[PDB]
Amino acid sequence: QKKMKYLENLVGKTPMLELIFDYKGEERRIFVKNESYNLTGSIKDRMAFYTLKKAYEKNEIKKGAPIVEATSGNTGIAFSAMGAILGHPVIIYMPDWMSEERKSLIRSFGAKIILVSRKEGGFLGSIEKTKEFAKNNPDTYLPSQFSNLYNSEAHYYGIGLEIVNEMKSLNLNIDGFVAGVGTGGTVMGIGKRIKENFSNAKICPLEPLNSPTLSTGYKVAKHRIEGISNEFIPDLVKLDKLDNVVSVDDGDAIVMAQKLAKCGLGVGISSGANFIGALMLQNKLGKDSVIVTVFPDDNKKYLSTDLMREEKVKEDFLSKDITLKEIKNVLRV
Amino acid sequence: QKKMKYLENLVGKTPMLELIFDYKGEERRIFVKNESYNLTGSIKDRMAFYTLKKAYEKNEIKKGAPIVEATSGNTGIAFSAMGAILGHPVIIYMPDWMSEERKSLIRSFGAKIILVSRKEGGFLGSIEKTKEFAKNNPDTYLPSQFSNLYNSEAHYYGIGLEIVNEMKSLNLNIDGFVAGVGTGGTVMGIGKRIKENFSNAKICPLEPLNSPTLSTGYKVAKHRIEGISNEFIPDLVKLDKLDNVVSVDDGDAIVMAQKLAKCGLGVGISSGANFIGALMLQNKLGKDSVIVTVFPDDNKKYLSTDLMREEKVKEDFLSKDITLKEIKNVLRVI
Ligand SMILES: C=C(/N=C/c1c(COP(=O)(O)O)cnc(C)c1O)C(=O)O
Ligand SMILES: C=C(/N=C/c1c(COP(=O)(O)O)cnc(C)c1O)C(=O)O
């Protein structure tokens, strides 16, 4: 309680960057939150902390109860660290094709990690195994990130608020916001906050072009944008209450992430995707529209992946016409 | 200059943690700066930013000039990122037995990474190659971290000042400070700041027991505490102006780092070493003495190392009598 007050100093309050770049070849800018500046290096720390703090406040978790979750990586890492801080055993189910770094990290935080193959049902299968564990261990706390409102609320109260306060400090109206969807907590929570302040802002969820599950409603394929598009549309995301889906090719996302690293911003693959997405929305709203996005994590968990290999440029990539020019401002509140 | 003012928001202002633990039935606490909360994830971001900012101010670097450095990893990473932001090519020479993650990261930031074997002279060899590059290429900027006062100054003006302000806000006098030595910038700079505010504080440099270069003045051996004890005593560190050397076994450092990760603090190997060193100093000064240290980076670059394997506990390890109890406070002045 008092504890929860000081433990919040481990999450959030991250830099907002103004990134200037040339696009075929007009001067453009985009605003981005750098979420590596967090306990375990991702935006998910804000959500795990908020989720457990509220669960404590509402008596939904007992002391020493296991926390059990299914993850693409970061949320598992986040609950493993914060659970260990708060004295909980943590058990994480994760698909076996997520980066090796994610598995090692979860184990380093003292959690039990159970990998789940395509054969055992992947993401939906991971989720079912968490529920089977809860049935067989009735003290279990299930954060239920793919459906729990605490997830979107974390970002309404945390990062979304920082974003509205920071843009207001620059006397800029927010015209749009883009984020890749895994659970949708990011887009929904930030979206809610932004729209209460700017009722015409466009809030766009993002998907891989290779696995366009949101825009089609059903299509699922392999893609390399780790963390988003986890083989189903999560209950938390409400596509009818968001603006149009933005779709980015996973190679375009990679190239963009590589370029961001060569201007000093070592980001994960979904950060590259978000950057491209923000540009796509800016292209629709006007070259000077004020678009915000987020960089969910750094590049450290992606050294084993195609982020570190040469990616073939295709004719429809936006990245090929982008030259990053400068970090034009950094705010930290 | 206006640029340097806003770019500083990418470094520093990191959490100070109060960590409570049991050591032989006594309740102990130790204060630690969590330096993962930085541009590239390490304390070295503060130093690279400071070094280049001052170099710019004093006209010691030209626009587009190459920044060339020899590193155990983090400082190379830090200069690579900050150099890229400021429009500089970066060239890094690094021994080939540093973690693979370090090499990939430096490249990811667009720097040229040249690896240097034990046969080619290791760290001193890496340093010589930076100087040969500068002699061949006359507008080369050499941050020269093993000897440049800007390095210790970074920490005098940055992290050392945060530490003094934070401990003063808790009404606590600082009795000691411990940090592993690579360049010595951390210990010298923080030490200077702490001693100006607490003239009786002990400032102790730390080394690996397995490669006790500081306390012997000569011995060099293989050890796994990446980032410290880089095969020589750096000119920057002044052992005669510091308090006694603290030596930690690299297995003991590993176990301590593993334990920290199991209480939610995913830290590098030198962070484990520093925690043990703080305890050793506390043991000498008094169970209640106020000891401060730093955790230079997270565990992400160490997934390929013994940090992720089972370490054999030896009888002389301090880690084996430590039980972490809780994160008792976190301060953050942003
Ligand atoms: C679903 C998860 N992650 C989402 C994620 C996302 C998508 O954010 P939301 O899950 O809040 O939609 C974007 N980028 C990265 C690196 C991510 O790790 C998870 O870690 O379980
Ligand atoms: C010599 C360097 N590293 C220092 C370092 C140190 C030693 O810090 P000082 O250089 O300030 O002594 C401790 N821990 C870690 C993880 C480090 O990377 C360098 O990164 O090149």
Three-class DSSP labels, A32-95: EEECCCCCCCECHHHHHHHHHHHHHHCCCCCCCCCEEEECCCHHHHHHHHHHHHCCCCEEEEEE
Distance separating alpha carbons of residues B186 and B183, to the nearest angstrom: 8
Residue nearest to ligand 2 atom 6, measured at CA: B227
Q: What is the CATH number of the domain that holds B198?
A: 3.40.50.1100
Q: Which strands form B112-116's sheet, in the order they lie side by side?
A: B67-70, B90-95, B112-116
**Residue B182 beta carbon below 6 angstroms from any ligand 2 atom:** yes
Q: Report the domain count for chain A.
A: 2
**Residue A296 beta carbon below 6 angstroms from any ligand 1 atom:** yes
* Separation of CA B182 and ligand 2 centre (Å): 5
| Same structural domain, A21 and A167 | yes
Taking each helix axis from N to C end, the angle separating A44-57 and A149-157, rounded to the nearest 10 degrees, works out to 110
For A322, the 3-state DSSP assignment is strand
> Which residue, among B37, B102, B326, would best test binding to A if mutated, counting the most A CBs under 10 Å from its CB?
B37
Residue nearest to ligand 2 atom 18, measured at CA: B227
Does residue B98 fall inside a structural domain? yes
* Separation of CA A186 and ligand 1 centre (Å): 8
What's A297's DSSP letter?
B
Give me the residues of B, 283-322, that contact A with CB < 8 A: 298-301, 303, 307-308
* Residue (of B85, B84, B11, B66) closest to B44 by Cα position: B11
A7, A262, A307 member nearest B109 (Cβ): A262
* Residue (of A277, A273, A304, A302) closest to A292 by Cα position: A277
| Same structural domain, B217 and B109 | no
A41, A266, A333 member nearest B105 (Cβ): A266
Of A89, A117, A145, the position where a domain reaches its end is A145
Angle at A13 between CA A10 and CA A19, to 5 degrees: 135
Distance separating alpha carbons of residues B271 and B297, to the nearest angstrom: 7
Which structural technique was applied? Answer: X-ray
| Same structural domain, B5 and B115 | no
Ligand 2 atom closest to the CA of B184, numbered from 1 = 12
Does residue B328 fall inside a structural domain? no
| Contact residues, chain A, for B10 at CB < 8 Å | 15, 330
For B67, the 3-state DSSP assignment is strand
Distance separating alpha carbons of residues B108 and A265, to the nearest angstrom: 10
| Same structural domain, A22 and A47 | no
| Same structural domain, B253 and B112 | no
| Same structural domain, B275 and B163 | yes
Distance separating alpha carbons of residues A246 and A236, to the nearest angstrom: 18
Q: Give residues with Cβ within 8 angstroms of A313, minimum separation 6.
A: A251, A255, A319, A320
Answer whether A255's CB lies under 8 Å from A24's CB.
no
| Same structural domain, B28 and B45 | no
Per DSSP bridges, beta strands B26-34 and A26-34 are unpaired
A293 is in an annotated binding site: no
| Same structural domain, A205 and A282 | yes
A74 is in an annotated binding site: yes
B266 is in which domain, residue-wise?
1-37+159-311
Distance separating alpha carbons of residues B12 and B109, to the nearest angstrom: 20
| Same structural domain, A10 and A47 | no
